[PDB]
Amino acid sequence: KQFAVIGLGRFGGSIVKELHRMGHEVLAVDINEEKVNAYASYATHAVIANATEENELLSLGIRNFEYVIVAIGANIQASTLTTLLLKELDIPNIWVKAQNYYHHKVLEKIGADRIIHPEKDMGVKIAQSLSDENVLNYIDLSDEYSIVELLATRKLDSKSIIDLNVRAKYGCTILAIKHHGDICLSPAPEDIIREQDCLVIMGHKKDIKRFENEGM
Amino acid sequence: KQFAVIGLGRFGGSIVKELHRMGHEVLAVDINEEKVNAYASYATHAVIANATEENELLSLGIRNFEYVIVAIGANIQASTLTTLLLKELDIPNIWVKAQNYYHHKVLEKIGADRIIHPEKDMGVKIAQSLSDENVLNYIDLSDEYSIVELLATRKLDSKSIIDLNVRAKYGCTILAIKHHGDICLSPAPEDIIREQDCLVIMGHKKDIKRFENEGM
Amino acid sequence: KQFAVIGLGRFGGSIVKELHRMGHEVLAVDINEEKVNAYASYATHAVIANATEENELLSLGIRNFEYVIVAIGANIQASTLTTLLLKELDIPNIWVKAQNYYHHKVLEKIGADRIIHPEKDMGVKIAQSLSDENVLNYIDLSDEYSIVELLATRKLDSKSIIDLNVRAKYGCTILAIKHHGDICLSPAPEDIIREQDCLVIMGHKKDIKRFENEGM
Amino acid sequence: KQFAVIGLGRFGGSIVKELHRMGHEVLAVDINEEKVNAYASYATHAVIANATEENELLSLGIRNFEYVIVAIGANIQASTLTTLLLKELDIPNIWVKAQNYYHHKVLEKIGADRIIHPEKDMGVKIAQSLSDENVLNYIDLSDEYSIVELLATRKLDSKSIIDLNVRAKYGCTILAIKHHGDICLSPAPEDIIREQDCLVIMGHKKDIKRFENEGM
Amino acid sequence: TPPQVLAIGFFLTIIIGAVLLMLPISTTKPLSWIDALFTAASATTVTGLAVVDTGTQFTVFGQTVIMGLIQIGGLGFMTFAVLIVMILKIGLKERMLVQEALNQPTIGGVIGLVKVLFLFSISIELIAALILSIRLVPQYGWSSGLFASLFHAISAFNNAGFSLWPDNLMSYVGDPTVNLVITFLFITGGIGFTVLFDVMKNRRFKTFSLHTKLMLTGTLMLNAIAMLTVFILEYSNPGTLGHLHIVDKLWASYFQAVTPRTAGFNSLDFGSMREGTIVFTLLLMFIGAGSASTASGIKLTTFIVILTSVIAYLRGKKETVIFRRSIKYPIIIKALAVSVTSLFIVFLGIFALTITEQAPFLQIVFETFSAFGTVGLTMGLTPELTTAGKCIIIVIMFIGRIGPLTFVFSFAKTEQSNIRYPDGEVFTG
Amino acid sequence: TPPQVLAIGFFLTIIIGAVLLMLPISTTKPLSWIDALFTAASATTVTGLAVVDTGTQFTVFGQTVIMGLIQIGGLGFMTFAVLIVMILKIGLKERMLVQEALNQPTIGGVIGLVKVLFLFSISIELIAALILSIRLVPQYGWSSGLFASLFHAISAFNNAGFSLWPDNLMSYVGDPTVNLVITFLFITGGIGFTVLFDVMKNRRFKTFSLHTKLMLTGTLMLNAIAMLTVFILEYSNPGTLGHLHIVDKLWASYFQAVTPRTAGFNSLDFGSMREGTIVFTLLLMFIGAGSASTASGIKLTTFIVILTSVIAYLRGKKETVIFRRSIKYPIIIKALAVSVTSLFIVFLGIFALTITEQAPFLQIVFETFSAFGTVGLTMGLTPELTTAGKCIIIVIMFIGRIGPLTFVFSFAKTEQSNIRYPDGEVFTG
Numbered sequence A, B, C, D: 001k002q003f004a005v006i007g008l009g010r011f012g013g014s015i016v017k018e019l020h021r022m023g024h025e026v027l028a029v030d031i032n033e034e035k036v037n038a039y040a041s042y043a044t045h046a047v048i049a050n051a052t053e054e055n056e057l058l059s060l061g062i063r064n065f066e067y068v069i070v071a072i073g074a075n076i077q078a079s080t081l082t083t084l085l086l087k088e089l090d091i092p093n094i095w096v097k098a099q100n101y102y103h104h105k106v107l108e109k110i111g112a113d114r115i116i117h118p119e120k121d122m123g124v125k126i127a128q129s130l131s132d133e134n135v136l137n138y139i140d141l142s143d144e145y146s147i148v149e150l151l152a153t154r155k156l157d158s159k160s161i162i163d164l165n166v167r168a169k170y171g172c173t174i175l176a177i178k179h180h181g182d183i184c185l186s187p188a189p190e191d192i193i194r195e196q197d198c199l200v201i202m203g204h205k206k207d208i209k210r211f212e213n214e215g216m
Numbered sequence E, F: 001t002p003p004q005v006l007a008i009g010f011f012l013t014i015i016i017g018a019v020l021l022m023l024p025i026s027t028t029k030p031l032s033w034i035d036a037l038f039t040a041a042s043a044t045t046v047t048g049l050a051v052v053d054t055g056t057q058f059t060v061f062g063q064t065v066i067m068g069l070i071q072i073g074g075l076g077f078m079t080f081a082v083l084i085v086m087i088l089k090i091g092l093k094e095r096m097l098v099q100e101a102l103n104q105p106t107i108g109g110v111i112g113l114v115k116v117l118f119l120f121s122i123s124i125e126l127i128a129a130l131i132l133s134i135r136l137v138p139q140y141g142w143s144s145g146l147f148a149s150l151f152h153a154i155s156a157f158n159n160a161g162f163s164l165w166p167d168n169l170m171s172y173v174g175d176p177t178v179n180l181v182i183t184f185l186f187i188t189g190g191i192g193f194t195v196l197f198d199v200m201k202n203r204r205f206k207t208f209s210l211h212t213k214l215m216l217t218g219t220l221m222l223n224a225i226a227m228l229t230v231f232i233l234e235y236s237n238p239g240t241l242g243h244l245h246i247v248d249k250l251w252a253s254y255f256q257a258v259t260p261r262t263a264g265f266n267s268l269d270f271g272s273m274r275e276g277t278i279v280f281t282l283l284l285m286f287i288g289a290g291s292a293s294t295a296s297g298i299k300l301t302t303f304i305v306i307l308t309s310v311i312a313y314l315r316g317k318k319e320t321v322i323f324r325r326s327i328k329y330p331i332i333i334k335a336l337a338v339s340v341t342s343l344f345i346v347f348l349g350i351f352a353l354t355i356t357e358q359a360p361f362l363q364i365v366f367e368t369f370s371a372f373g374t375v376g377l378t379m380g381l382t383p384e385l386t387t388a389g390k391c392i393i394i395v396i397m398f399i400g401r402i403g404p405l406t407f408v409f410s411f412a413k414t415e416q417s418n419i420r421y422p423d424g425e426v427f428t429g
Ligand SMILES: Nc1ncnc2c1ncn2[C@@H]1O[C@H](COP(=O)(O)OP(=O)(O)OP(=O)(O)O)[C@@H](O)[C@H]1O
Pocket: A006, A007, A008, A009, A010, A011, A012, A029, A030, A031, A032, A035, A049, A050, A051, A052, A071, A072, A073, A074, A075, A078, A097
């Protein structure tokens, strides 16, 4: 129930700002004074501390915390030492930001509980939307199956959900339609799809792109 | 005996830390505040001071100390000036860390009582163990004669002390055997030597390596 | 009318210093402490503040100012952010210093009310005086028509205002004569013009330079 | 009556230290805190001040000083500004240290009362002693005439002054002899000159070197 | 300058006030030179001490002059100046004075604080005073009831101390309405206008400023100490609180714990208290309540800061920190300046008065502290003061209200030496 | 343990001292439990207050025990500990305690200070006391003369306050020998051993340390103020100084200006002084004399620092500076800690005693201040104290002498939090 965010980056600072908005107990830690001062208002607490020094980490009473997040992603030395301290101090959940494949490897071996590549992950997702101008957003259920949010082209304007079937033709299923902000969850055929309306499809990754090609 | 360690390096800091664990009187000096704060707990006493300034050295009451150790090995200027001050202030024993042959020379000429090259010395010892995978540890009695600790190969497993003699064959003498942690000092022939048991031999440096070749 | 000068440059500092000498209400803002301290005496008021932080700008009560001048011309990032804040906070008149054409463009798009290039402007004016050693000072009425102050050569010494008519001959009109400090505004023909007197002519830019060539 | 040394260099610091040993009133000024603290004991007064800022110079009550010495020789900007201030503030005697020919020129034009090149001057004097191994020390009376202190070679051991006349023979005059520390001012012929005795000759620069060649 | 303007303007409304009160229409029995100035001063400096009884000596007119001066001093000379102009704008020069007057570090929308504080004042003054203090006070009629119910509010909220009638409210030791309605008024008036605006706006236990947080928890726990103190000490003592029902023993122990900073109302007599309680009440009224504010000498926060600073030093953490938001140095040294000045002045008042007057010591001491603290409480020298002693209490009341600092800053030559000096070793132990 | 060792060792020589004094050989008339501990404490804490008269109650033996404890406390528990060992070496661990005991920032040749201070002590104690106080005190014979002349020196130099005979020296109001020889002793004992060693070594008006410079000019001008104060105030008053020749009016005005810090000798009775003078004497004995030293509660320098600091702030120069050698921050905050602690303790003693005793207020106040200041002067509650009141004066004498700080540091949990916290805005005005 208690959270500690060490490293008030753009990533770290967003976690401490969000968790606090959700109304949790969050300790904001950073070696830079100016960063601490800034997040003072957006955290249950703010403290200037060098997370690589043990006595400084004990002074925070770090052992109190259920979840500690190390969002230091530029300094590998700072990150690895901190996480090692946290593991040595028996913190239950240690979530760390990694810089690259190698930093991930060091963290893995010193027992970080969950490792995140916020930039690389958001990279591939944005790249997908660049390459395929139709995909607005998506979530992968596995390597093969995925739920995709698609911007409807004029190729679908005033088309019927029963008429242009996805279930029989492509083996995919339409989950939602968003026309002018209004949302039709679990839509019943037939329904009108206008141009620029958010279409949420679900199925095999290859199957969807086949629908994208031939349907749109 | 009162001790003063000027320069809380990895070397200096280890002397202070050890002498204090032994329970002596040790004054820990360093120009870096953070270093002093760190060794506060591991010294009879810690003080922020610039050892090159005379008045600052007198403020410590340096003339009180029987032994002063200058473990500044990176800064030649800091080291030489400090040691010169210490000699001028009539300190009985001045032990200094040197960087290289030339730094040793300057220290020699300004009257350092004992000069140590902790890195170079440990360098050659580790190199010996690298080259000869059999030698675990050793101590030189002179340039020619040495006591060597050897890891026993399968070439010695379940061999008897008298049976595989060195006192007659190689002109060396076995001093100890360590099997599974248990220690047999000045062992009486015959004794069983298992594989990976620490064998402590003593004699001429060339003689031992001849035993290493033919015996192991 | 209340004034706020953010950025106590050579330019900014001159505005606060002048406006204050005129006896207006001027708030002098600068992130550099030493700058604030210096202009303390030459402003209604001096405050150390980072103009890019919103809360710091509100602390000044910036919304209380009719005119805010951003004389940060070296830092584009500081300038653009500040001006954006000022526009967002609904300041009526925002006058900014620009570094170059591109900085001007960013300021334009974020709604700076008037943009000034004090150096480039003074550059061209000084260049004119370099090229044409006769022109002491000038003011452009448009791209084509201009009022010019000219240093009289020996080519005009003891010449009569009317006798050497510019009105009929060149289509320009003489507005003033300054002989030994004494000023004759709207002079009546004939008047004596000595060497090194200040002659103030008015007309077409090309016309004046034709008079400069043939008259002087 | 009163001395102010701005710039506690090796040069400046030596002036303050000497004048104070002589028991004068000396104000030691320096922008570097550590320098001021050091010369605290060796001055009538020590003050941290930036000599280029006017108000700071007035705070010292600089106008109270008969002689102000600017021993800033590395920073030309610091030196020139300071000296300009001092001249503007009507200090009677301004003695400045110069870096090079050009810095000397700037100081000359802004009215420094006496300019000194401590290094260049000591340079030429030491060079003379290097080139001519015989000359221990000297003082120039003019460009042509000089008093020179010479180390006597074996070429003069147990020689009589009147016997080896410098006057009749070379047009120079011997002023003093220093044998084993004992000094014979204005010596009467004949006197014994041993080897390595200090011989003080006086005359024309060319004449002395002729004696050096043929006599020694 | 900003400090001088505060000072001269404040001093003037005392002179104005004194001449108005010495005026026939306001006095029943002819009034002295010194006493007209003293009573005026005590209303406008919101002290609460009076050489001459308020209910008897002053006409309904003079008692309205008293309310005005209480209103003026309680909210702040400048606050009205700003309102006058507002209603009649608003310059930076003016915003500068206001910031100084409301002891603010920033000039940030400080007129928004003046807007709030005044509207909130007359609001709670009216609704609580007129309405609630008429529920149980038209047994004086209408002409007496509605005027005494109003007067007591303006006096309460502003921490005046001025009660209309001879019993400075001893009469109502038990009456819950007068107890509550008057404490509600004088405690909330006390704590920062900062604290009021902050509580009104932010509205949540957590999102309060470090000031507001310190004030809300500080005023609560000190009150709870002082009540326990007043109870335990004055419980046995028959002179006050001995002869009261276990319930009324509270309403008195509560009120006397709460009134010293810096209200000045009597639920019991202060003359008849075990000297220990009085000693404790001295400290409790050196420390005012809040820095916004209605009044204080050195204000509650100042006390925390200096104390918590020394506590910190003794540990010793390198930086002084409360609530895990650390306290910058410029606060400590200002606190140390507020502290020393106030105490030194109080000491001079004590030293002066033991040479200005023949009287008991503790009574002089309590008197000086209550004068500087603009408290209003006495064991009763107040009527018995020498003409000279009245003068030096007037001074001590003037400095205490205006702030011991901004008084010095009125005649202080502002000297900015930019040069530094070498270190100097000096033993303090 | 450097602070604890100072404390436990000091406390022990009081217990040792008490048991020695309760012992038959030292008492003429059987002595109480509480009184044996009180009188012992007052000699060893160099206070000067006695519940039981010294000349009457204590045998020649007991009076030597008194001298010993006065010698012990006056120079410092550790000073002798070091001398014992010296004569019997010398560890850093020891040099650490000595530095702490002589309130020194550096451990630099601090044994050289112990060497000097002791040798200088017994030197001036002997030559001035035995010799000079025997040339005009053999009018008591030899067995009485040579012992009372010696006792009064050890008491004088160490700022004890203990006079052998019933008149705490009123007898000699005019006698120049006793006036001079005893002031010479108790003022030079007062100012820093720092100041003595520095004056002895450096020998020039110019080359004195900031401390020494401040002490020499500080002690001079405060004495000159206090003498003028004692004169002007107690001039008319017939009770003391009224019936004295214009010359003896000085020898008394001088002595009473000089004795409050922290000697404790009576030239005039303090009970019969215009209350103003007493008030002034309170302040004058809160501020001790010197920090070396013989004794104080909060030492003269501390007062300068804090005062000059506030003065500086009010101008306000960014840094606090005296004699054009600026004062570092760590001095200010220690000064602010010495200051607050001492005053808070004195306040608790006053608050306690007005609950622990039935007596006049001013008399309790003067008593607490003099107990903490290890002064020794009373308007005379001392014999009249309750058994409980004696206890709490014993405590106040213990803390006051040991230093209010090093007392706290004995039971203080040393916590060094390396983490910092965000800024917190807090109004103090
Ligand atoms: N040893 C340390 N102890 C405490 N805080 C640290 C330490 N090292 C770095 N930090 C802080 O943690 C953060 C480390 O982030 P770093 O910015 O420098 O790159 P980053 O993780 O990629 O940033 P971002 O989250 O914006 O992508 C910074 O806010 C930094 O100030």
